[PDB]
Design a protein around this ligand. Sequence first.
Ligand code: FTZ
Length: 337
Amino acid sequence: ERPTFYRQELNKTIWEVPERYQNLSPVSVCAAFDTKTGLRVAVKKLSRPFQSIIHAKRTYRELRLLKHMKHENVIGLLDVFTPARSLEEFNDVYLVTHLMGADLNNIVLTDDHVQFLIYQILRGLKYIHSADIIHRDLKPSNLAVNEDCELKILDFGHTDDEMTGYVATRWYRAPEIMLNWMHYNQTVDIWSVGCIMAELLTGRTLFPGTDHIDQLKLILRLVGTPGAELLKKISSESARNYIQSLTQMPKMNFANVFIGANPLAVDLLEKMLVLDSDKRITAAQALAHAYFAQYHDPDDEPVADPYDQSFESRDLLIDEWKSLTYDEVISFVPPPL
Ligand SMILES: Fc1cccc(Cl)c1CNc1nc(-c2ccco2)n[nH]1
């Protein structure tokens, strides 16, 4: 009742998977056909999952999060497995998820398409947020879609160099995390959605900053320089002091930046791209905004079960994180259909 495994070298690396998975080809991640469900799937083999304390914890983190997500606009775990028969042999973790059509880069729209896509991102963010999970990293490339425009949020669980220069890895991040102004929270995801929604409407990056400071300048041009109250809340005195060096600018008219756009879109953007994260609209409030009248259904916008992440504040040995990851592998129950 443990399935039979077969071995196969791909991108210089040996993949050992259950017979159910066939037609493995690279995309480490491989596309495959799952003969038991009839689904096209992505299969990720984690590299050196238990090499260090930090990597062991990250592997546990990733497996906990994926095991938890059971929502249509969020990417779920279809299977998790290992070729090992015991903890002592355990050293490889394979994660199986749906293969999606295309990310949101490839796809860049009508106002109907923008409503439907942003609706879906918010529906999934409500679910994620209600479990006190923060995505941190929402961008077009973490948002996959199919032929029918049905959307899933991807990639849960970034160096100084990756975040430097003219790079998409920073264009969608909220200013408070981009510059470490304060202990940030869930609201940073809403900032990202604002950036994405703007991009879907204009076909152009909202804040294509050439570095952190240029981006901040582009941001402050649009939404205004911070006010007295927001300044108080910037915990970092070095950053607060830098902000105060800038000459004050008022919030621009959004109707004149997003010309031709549905006024309800303009309105929603204004509530999303508010500099003060305490005054940003929530995923749950956004869903009730008139812009989504076509799609809004308060009975089909579910929330998540509670998610214990007390493990985040725990300092454990490698073997202990590996043991905890083992338990979660062998306890995995697949979804029903
Ligand atoms: F996001 C995760 C997390 C854990 C494992 C895996 Cl394989 C993934 C990526 N999954 C996935 N990506 C896509 C996709 C399709 C097109 C662009 O992205 N479909 N499915």
